[PDB]
Design a protein around this motif. Structure first.
Motif, PDB file in Angstrom:
ATOM      1  N   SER A 145     -19.637   5.787   2.114  1.00 25.08           N
ATOM      2  CA  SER A 145     -19.719   7.168   2.541  1.00 25.08           C
ATOM      3  C   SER A 145     -20.304   8.047   1.438  1.00 25.08           C
ATOM      4  N   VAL A 146     -21.094   9.058   1.828  1.00 23.84           N
ATOM      5  CA  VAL A 146     -21.414  10.191   0.967  1.00 23.84           C
ATOM      6  C   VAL A 146     -21.311  11.489   1.772  1.00 23.84           C
ATOM      7  N   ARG A 190     -24.861  21.724  -4.329  1.00 22.31           N
ATOM      8  CA  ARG A 190     -23.615  21.019  -4.600  1.00 22.31           C
ATOM      9  C   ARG A 190     -23.000  21.699  -5.822  1.00 22.31           C
ATOM     10  N   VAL A 194     -19.118   6.001  -1.927  1.00 18.12           N
ATOM     11  CA  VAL A 194     -17.782   5.523  -2.192  1.00 18.12           C
ATOM     12  C   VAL A 194     -17.301   4.752  -0.963  1.00 18.12           C
ATOM     13  N   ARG A 195     -16.484   3.713  -1.205  1.00 21.37           N
ATOM     14  CA  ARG A 195     -15.891   2.915  -0.146  1.00 21.37           C
ATOM     15  C   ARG A 195     -14.879   3.793   0.576  1.00 21.37           C
ATOM     16  N   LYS A 196     -14.921   3.795   1.908  1.00 23.79           N
ATOM     17  CA  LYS A 196     -14.077   4.710   2.657  1.00 23.79           C
ATOM     18  C   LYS A 196     -13.709   4.092   3.994  1.00 23.79           C
ATOM     19  N   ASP A 197     -12.426   4.150   4.331  1.00 24.22           N
ATOM     20  CA  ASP A 197     -11.971   3.647   5.614  1.00 24.22           C
ATOM     21  C   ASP A 197     -12.373   4.588   6.746  1.00 24.22           C
ATOM     22  N   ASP A 198     -12.292   4.053   7.960  1.00 23.75           N
ATOM     23  CA  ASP A 198     -12.725   4.792   9.118  1.00 23.75           C
ATOM     24  C   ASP A 198     -11.814   4.459  10.285  1.00 23.75           C
ATOM     25  N   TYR A 219     -21.710   1.803   7.885  1.00 23.12           N
ATOM     26  CA  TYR A 219     -20.724   0.769   8.169  1.00 23.12           C
ATOM     27  C   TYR A 219     -21.042  -0.490   7.351  1.00 23.12           C
ATOM     28  N   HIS A 225     -22.408   7.972   6.564  1.00 25.10           N
ATOM     29  CA  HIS A 225     -21.899   6.640   6.262  1.00 25.10           C
ATOM     30  C   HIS A 225     -22.821   5.516   6.729  1.00 25.10           C
ATOM     31  N   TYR A 283     -13.432  17.067   3.489  1.00 28.85           N
ATOM     32  CA  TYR A 283     -13.654  15.641   3.363  1.00 28.85           C
ATOM     33  C   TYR A 283     -12.773  15.117   2.234  1.00 28.85           C
ATOM     34  N   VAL A 284     -12.179  13.926   2.423  1.00 29.37           N
ATOM     35  CA  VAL A 284     -11.334  13.362   1.378  1.00 29.37           C
ATOM     36  C   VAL A 284     -11.749  11.935   1.038  1.00 29.37           C
ATOM     37  N   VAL A 285     -12.029  11.713  -0.249  1.00 33.80           N
ATOM     38  CA  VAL A 285     -12.094  10.375  -0.810  1.00 33.80           C
ATOM     39  C   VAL A 285     -11.625  10.411  -2.263  1.00 33.80           C
ATOM     40  N   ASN A 286     -10.917   9.339  -2.667  1.00 30.05           N
ATOM     41  CA  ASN A 286     -10.493   9.129  -4.044  1.00 30.05           C
ATOM     42  C   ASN A 286      -9.600  10.274  -4.498  1.00 30.05           C
ATOM     43  N   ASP A 343      -8.925  10.517   6.042  1.00 30.99           N
ATOM     44  CA  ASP A 343     -10.221   9.872   6.233  1.00 30.99           C
ATOM     45  C   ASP A 343     -10.930  10.453   7.456  1.00 30.99           C
ATOM     46  N   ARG A 356     -13.069  12.287  10.048  1.00 29.27           N
ATOM     47  CA  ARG A 356     -14.386  12.901   9.965  1.00 29.27           C
ATOM     48  C   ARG A 356     -14.504  14.102  10.904  1.00 29.27           C
TER      49      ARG A 356
END
Ligand SMILES: Cc1nc(=O)c2cc(CN(C)c3ccc(C(=O)N[C@@H](CCC(=O)O)C(=O)O)s3)ccc2[nH]1
Ligand SMILES: Cc1nc(=O)c2cc(CN(C)c3ccc(C(=O)N[C@@H](CCC(=O)O)C(=O)O)s3)ccc2[nH]1
Ligand SMILES: O=c1[nH]c(=O)n([C@H]2C[C@H](O)[C@@H](COP(=O)(O)O)O2)cc1F
Ligand SMILES: O=c1[nH]c(=O)n([C@H]2C[C@H](O)[C@@H](COP(=O)(O)O)O2)cc1F
Lengths: 288, 288
Positions: free
Chosen positions: B32-33, A39, B20-24, B233, B231, A177-180, A148, A150
């Motif tokens: 999600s990680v 990473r 992290v909280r992530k929509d799907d 759910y 993830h 990948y996208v978050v935050n 979001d 995948r």
């Protein structure tokens, strides 16, 4: 917080301590490990190695070359980057039974698969506009609009096209990948020359992530590097042993020098690496 | 020596703690990680999970299904395994746009790409004998003739075939590796439902390693599972908190009950799991 570069070197020390001996196509032989992951944060740092001088101009130029779809080694050589000349030479081509092929012509490799996956490859000079899937563009579109998702993948492993290529791609697929509001990239590198190819490859996909972050209004996040066959060529061991003894220096930063709106509008002059003072270069003989 | 299963559970704990909280796509939500790797040893153990009962018949029938090269949910349902039915049903087909497709017809999915990559997909009842690339046979060939090969690769990610499929593949690619008469396998899973899909998937590719090992003369080695979007759910956080309390029992064993030569010869009765003593099953409802 530990230094980004320790991921890489620990992978080195790991293979040296635990790699098993194994033959390779080239005859050279290797110590190898199957499956690794590293990473590298892209946040206010860029992972261009400091324990040896990595060919930055070669990294940036190679990427711009893939972007524009080129399977012509001479288009790259003429920018002063030689790294594919040997794979395009008459001799190398003859050796794979492509006597009929114009030299420089690598076959349907990276740039082609990125911008025209599925097109029927003819030669390095043909026009492929509108042919096949523009995977790179489909990735930028998904990221702008459906972040979001995948399925943001770009694949260069085309089994229909393998027999035509000068070298089957080693960086086979990658996923964004996208978050935050962060853009992260993961790369599946099927086969990794730890001494030579790998550090370059990390700079490559790190940069691609910066470019894509830029045009989509995201901040760069993580580069995750996954390897299949992680190998150290036998002739790399001494040079690498030398490398290990160096204390890593601050990773440089990357400045993109103006607002760019499409991926293809990027030019070498738009990028400035600041603060890069690596230890001296280390030559590793490339296996052929 | 820690239990292999602690890798799976460790990843669940890591997601729950750091995801992290992530929509799907389904609007269920996830933790999600991005980017993980685990290594399950296959030497004198088979990594079928014990902290809940894994649907083993399903694993077995699903793999033979993929091997048969079938893309028809009905040919798998008839064997008592219904995991693909929702995807092959009229309403769901129409939802996706396939007004025209016979019930059960999943499109060009895993079996197709494994056996006939590149061929123009017709429908599910078609004959594709010698029509695209046979990635599976090629993998077995390559293991027999050239085990040292760093391109022992199977890919289901065909960007062209994507808009024709019920669900773009999660098993995007895998790579095989041979050293000291040990066969290993690395799966790249772009998307992992840690609750439902993943334990099934681990078993799946572990099986395929045992099969290819059997008809190539090799001892099975490691399976390396790599993850894209890992993830949980939100409606799985509870079952998994129950799951993390149980203590794993010794992994079971697998025996191939007869000397089989081709991969197509394999039949459900060729396989026996010995010592599978799992904790009670936990239902994780499938997000939609
Ligand atoms: C066995 C093998 N290992 C490789 O790493 C490899 C790499 C490429 C292409 N590639 C992705 C490369 C990136 C960097 C490279 C290289 O040789 N550069 C030298 C510097 C050369 C120069 O300064 O002009 C280096 O980085 O040491 S080569 C092609 C075939 C290969 N073959
Ligand atoms: C959102 C989603 N998550 C998944 O994990 C998933 C998995 C599959 C296919 N697959 C790979 C499956 C493996 C196992 C399955 C399942 O539903 N198993 C039950 C059946 C047991 C029984 O009643 O006997 C279970 O695990 O309890 S479904 C298809 C769509 C998906 N969709
Ligand atoms: O970007 C690259 N990185 C890399 O490490 N290689 C190395 C890995 C291996 O040593 C060789 C490709 O060989 P093979 O096809 O036998 O895996 O090139 C090649 C590249 F193009
Ligand atoms: O073998 C499988 N494993 C798995 O985890 N999924 C899950 C992952 C994700 O939860 C969903 C696919 O959705 P997406 O395409 O949006 O990732 O199915 C599906 C399979 F077939």
């Amino acid at each position: 917080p530990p230094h980004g570069e320790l991921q890489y070197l620990g992978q080195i020390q790991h293979i040296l301590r635990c790699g098993v001996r194994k033959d390779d196509r080239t005859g050279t032989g290797t110590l190898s490990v199957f499956g690794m992951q590293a990473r590298y944060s892209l946040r206010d740092e860029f992972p261009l190695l400091t324990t040896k001088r990595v060919f930055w101009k070669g990294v940036l130029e190679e990427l711009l070359w893939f972007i524009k779809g080129s399977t012509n080694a001479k288009e790259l050589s003429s920018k002063g980057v030689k790294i594919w000349d040997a794979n395009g030479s008459r001799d190398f081509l003859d050796s794979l039974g492509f006597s009929t092929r114009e030299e420089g012509d690598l076959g349907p490799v990276y740039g082609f698969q990125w911008r025209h996956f599925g097109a029927e490859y003819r030669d390095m000079e043909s026009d492929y506009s509108g042919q096949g899937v523009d995977q790179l563009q489909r990735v930028i579109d998904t990221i702008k609009t459906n972040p979001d998702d995948r399925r943001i993948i770009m694949c260069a492993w085309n089994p229909r096209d393998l027999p035509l290529m000068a070298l089957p791609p080693c960086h086979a697929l990658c996923q964004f990948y996208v978050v935050n509001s962060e853009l992260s990239c993961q790369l599946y590198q099927r086969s990794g020359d730890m001494g030579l190819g790998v550090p370059f490859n990390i700079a490559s996909y790190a940069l691609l992530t910066y470019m894509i972050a830029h045009i989509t209004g995201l901040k760069p996040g993580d580069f995750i590097h996954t390897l299949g066959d992680a190998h150290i060529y036998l002739n790399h061991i001494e040079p690498l042993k030398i490398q290990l003894q160096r204390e890593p220096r601050p990773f440089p930063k990357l400045r993109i020098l103006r607002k760019v709106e499409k991926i293809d509008d990027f030019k070498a002059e738009d990028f400035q690496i600041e603060g890069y003072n690596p230890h001296p270069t280390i030559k590793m003989e490339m296996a052929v």
